[PDB]
Paper text:
The final model was refined at 1.5 Angstrom resolution to Rwork of 13.9% and Rfree of 16.8%. In addition to protein atoms, the final model includes 1 zinc ion in the active site, 1 chloride ion and 342 waters. The dimer formed by the crystallographic 2-fold axis buries 751 Å2 of total surface area and superimposes well with other known bacterial CA dimers. A chloride ion was built into 8σ 2Fo-Fc electron density at the center of the PprCA dimer interface. The ion is completely buried in the dimer interface between electropositive surfaces created by Arg176 and Arg226 from each chain. The Cl- ion is hexa-coordinated to the amide side chains of Asn178, symAsn178 (3.43 Å) and 4 water molecules (3.1–3.26 Å), close to the ideal Cl–O distance of 3.2 Å. The chloride ion in the dimer interface of PprCA may represent halophilic adaptation by PprCA to a high salt environment.
Carbonic anhydrases (CA; carbonate hydro-lyase EC 4.2.1.1) are metallo-enzymes that catalyze the reversible hydration of carbon dioxide (CO2) to bicarbonate.
Residue numbers in the entry:
A (entry chain A), B (entry chain A): 14 to 230
Amino acid sequence: EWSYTGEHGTEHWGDSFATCAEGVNQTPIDINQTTQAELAPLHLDYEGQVTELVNNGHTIQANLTGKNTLTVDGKTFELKQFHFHTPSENYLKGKQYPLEAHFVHATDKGELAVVAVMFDFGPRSNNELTTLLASIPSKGQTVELKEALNPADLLPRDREYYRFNGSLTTPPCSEGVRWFVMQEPQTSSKAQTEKLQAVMGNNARPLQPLNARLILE
Amino acid sequence: EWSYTGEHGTEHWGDSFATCAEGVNQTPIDINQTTQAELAPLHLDYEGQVTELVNNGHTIQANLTGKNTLTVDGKTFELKQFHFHTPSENYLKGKQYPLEAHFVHATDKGELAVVAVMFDFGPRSNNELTTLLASIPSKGQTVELKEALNPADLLPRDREYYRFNGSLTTPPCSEGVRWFVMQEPQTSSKAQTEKLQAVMGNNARPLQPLNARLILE
Ligand SMILES: [Cl-]
Ligand SMILES: [Zn+2]
Ligand SMILES: [Zn+2]
């Protein structure tokens, strides 16, 4: 239905999804100027498995089993899925990355929090991505992972983050979404990112204005 | 048209003003739990005069002449008006105040910023309020101030503030509004606040959820 370019592209998401066009607390943003703040460490307890990839024609999405939980702000947000954008949607200090992962979590009441991880180029294939992407499903299809994989291993080692209040970056672009963007990029070889990009195409939403928000670190 | 209670009261503002019902970055809030952050001092340069009071059936609003400017975030926000709510709309640490002033500023491009000042009870009449409120207009009317008054003198001496990203507290409840709530209350005698309340009635919007925001100090 909706797309990135064309008649149903980002410029027209408001036709069916009002918040995409009317909201002024949207994601993505350029994380450039920031405010130093006293922020609690995230509690990311990922103990389960990635089971499958789904291609819904918008992204490649990984689904999970087991207990994979983000605890922050006194709320318990279970990891629902993670998925990818090529190129990145958010920027860090004016830099766009080749690949960005969104780990999307929800409280049992439905409140959403996204942990974003940038993937920059490195010389070596990322082993966890090799496992994850061994078979990437085509549009409208799903593939069961051949091999075991814990999503914990896709997070960077260092867990410092930028925090802001934003939205989903895809329709319905709902607001009230906590964003935690990890400061340290993970690595993906250029070949790995190209493999994903050739399936997904350009599925990065354009940058949105910060407006009255401050970005914290 | 719109009101606080009844058919067109706060519970029904969404009928004509969608953001009032759909927004999740709204004002007012209870400023209770906060995040320590490195925030720039506000630059409040009020050098003009309060000319008149207008009663638009929603509040008592004071209009200005001269140069009265808030500079923050590299943007220049000119004071457009200030007005009052009885009781307060925002709370500080779970406490509602008898009276809250909103100093509403706009950049020349139209972007809005509100400086909020709580007024608590004190033994002495506030001299600037005595001047300001010597004649309070009835609904649908305006009164020219009898005496000179610089709005600077209504701000607290100490300028430390809480900051959050929110909305107008009246229709259209627009978002993308910077809120700077002064930490130090000003003083108004109980008699002065009662004088205003008897004209305005209860024009405080109920508290709104913080959602994904953090309040900074
Ligand atoms: Cl915010
Ligand atoms: Zn995403
Ligand atoms: Zn107000």
